[PDB]
Amino acid sequence: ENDRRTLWTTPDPEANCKVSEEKDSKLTLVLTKCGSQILASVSLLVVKGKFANINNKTNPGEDYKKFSVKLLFDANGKLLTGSSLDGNYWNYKNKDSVIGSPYENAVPFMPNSTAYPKIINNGTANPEDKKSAAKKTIVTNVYLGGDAAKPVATTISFNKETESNCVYSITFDFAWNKTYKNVPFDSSSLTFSYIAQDAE
Amino acid sequence: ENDRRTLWTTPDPEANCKVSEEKDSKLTLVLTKCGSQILASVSLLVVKGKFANINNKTNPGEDYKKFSVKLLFDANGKLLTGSSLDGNYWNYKNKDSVIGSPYENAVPFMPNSTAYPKIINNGTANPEDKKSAAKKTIVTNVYLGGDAAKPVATTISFNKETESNCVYSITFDFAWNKTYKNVPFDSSSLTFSYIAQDAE
Amino acid sequence: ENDRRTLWTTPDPEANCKVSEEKDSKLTLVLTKCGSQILASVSLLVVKGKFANINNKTNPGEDYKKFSVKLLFDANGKLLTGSSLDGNYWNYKNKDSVIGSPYENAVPFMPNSTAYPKIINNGTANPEDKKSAAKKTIVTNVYLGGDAAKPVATTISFNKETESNCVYSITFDFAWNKTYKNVPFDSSSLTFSYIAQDAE
């Protein structure tokens, strides 16, 4: 009904995500359709590993101050193995859980091919043929422990990845310059939208 | 018709809200059902009292430099007395207005208990199933006068309040570090979403 | 069916917008009806002229550091002549393309008159007598190249313009202080919502 309009991890998932090692994080992502767009809410709590309690005082160095989460999808919109997120509880909504069986098609939840092409190349491109790099991209912040003093630079990129010969993709890139001393990666929630691929 | 999907005060309200004194502010809040999520828009013009002409030069203190707006719901999603907003014109959409008679049940507009649960704040071990307080929070900025130079740090908290045996809450926290000389607290409009509760 | 819910510039549009010269930019604007709000997504690529390759080091004046795009509408919600945007492939969705006929009436997709009204005389007397300019405004940054290091102050504004006896107006205002050196104007995507005009 309204539930085929939503695809999510669950509102309160079990560990379902690899940031650093297997199942070290809980990603709550809900994708909903309002017509031609997807309306999305995301959140990330990391419960163990390299980012469960950041200390950039005792661990400075690029690799302790950034990471990314990738949703990779095949032609029908099925999650592919190379993904950060586990498929077990990624499915269509049902009264606060997921449908019994794993889904066959979710093309209408995928970021548009046309608005978000895989590669743009404006080296030798005439101006009227030029495409937008930036357009595939939402740049905002989230906040550790929902504290304004603790921003984390968030980039959401559509159809950026090539991993696993995927045809669609949602990437969440996270980075910070503050040197956070003993702060869990526990994010505020973030609203975002993108243009949906057309079914059939 | 499609106004059953909207619960919204009014597009243009009479002073309907308490920041510092009774009916001292005009809160515009619309909540629309986009399936499993609520898409909200919010503005706050304070019309009289302590925040109606901010002067941190003359009043340098903490209590002049922040305030908070609490909406308190019961089990049926009806608005409780403790709330900053008054329920006279808080109701479903009829054309450009509300339905005459106050609503029985708005539970499906409330923030999801599962996504955003009650957390009794005690020293808690084992982060691998501690429920996240950050998740319940959207952190962003509104701009006073719609001017980029005049930011206000804005925290939107779901299911945070303990007051009046509320089951559900939506709390707007406005704070600013900058020292403003005669600026009316007059916010830019802010878009946000959250995961909705389900019903019968 | 559901396509009559989307008023859009194509997802992958031809040069369609005047920032500086006729047809110097590709504006992507998607409007979808979600109940009583419009859920919008907006992005701007400039391909020629004065902002096709910003260099505030060679061009340091204000006129090279800011520009605005005006959508102007009439009482049917159809585009007018003064509009930045060429109203020739600006139509209701049909599949991944656009409908045969030009779009007739689209009043349901306009910013709400009551919510965002035209400015008059303001006074401290409060029988009802306050107007918030800010309420009419969403203020945020977008990011050139989708780079965190390259913010641009963005203001969206509803029913503000007076040009060509317009009833309804959407205006995107861009402004930066940073001195960009050989940066195409190519904005990261922006999600936003506003209250719709009530259809009849």
Numbering used by the authors:
A (entry chain A), B (entry chain C), C (entry chain B): 395 to 594
Quote from the publication.
We also used SPR to further probe the binding affinity of HAdV-D49K, and a mutant version, HAdV-D49.KO1.K, for CD46 and CAR. This HAdV-D49.KO1.K mutant, harbors the KO1 mutations S408E and P409A in the fiber knob AB loop, previously shown to ablate CAR binding in HAdV-C5K. As predicted, we did not observe binding between either fiber knob protein and CD46. However, we did observe HAdV-D49K binding to CAR with a detectable 0.19 μM affinity which was ablated by the KO1 mutation. However, no IC50 could be derived by using HAdV-D49K to block CD46 on CHO-BC1 cells, where HAdV-D49K was unable to achieve >20% inhibition of antibody binding, suggesting weak or incidental CD46 interactions. Therefore, these data support the findings from SPR and transduction experiments that HAdV-D49K may bind CAR with low affinity but does not bind CD46. We investigated the transduction efficiency of HAdV-C5/D30K compared to HAdV-C5/D49K, HAdV-C5, HAdV-C5.KO1, and HAdV-C5/D49.KO1.K in CHO-CAR and CHO-K1 cells. HAdV-C5 infected CHO-CAR cells efficiently, while the CAR-binding ablated KO1 mutant did not, and HAdV-C5/49K and the corresponding mutant HAdV-C5/49KO1.K infected CHO-CAR cells with similar efficiency, as observed for HAdV-C5/D49K in Fig. 1A. In CHO-K1 cells, HAdV-C5/D49K and the KO1 mutant were the only viruses that achieved efficient transduction. In support of this, we show that a mutant vector, HAdV-C5/D49.KO1.K, containing mutations within the fiber knob domain which ablate CAR affinity, retained the ability to efficiently transduce cells in the absence of any detectable binding to CAR. We demonstrate that the HAdV-D49 fiber knob has a weak affinity for CAR, although it is not dependent upon this interaction to mediate efficient cell entry, and in fact the presence of CAR may inhibit cellular transduction.
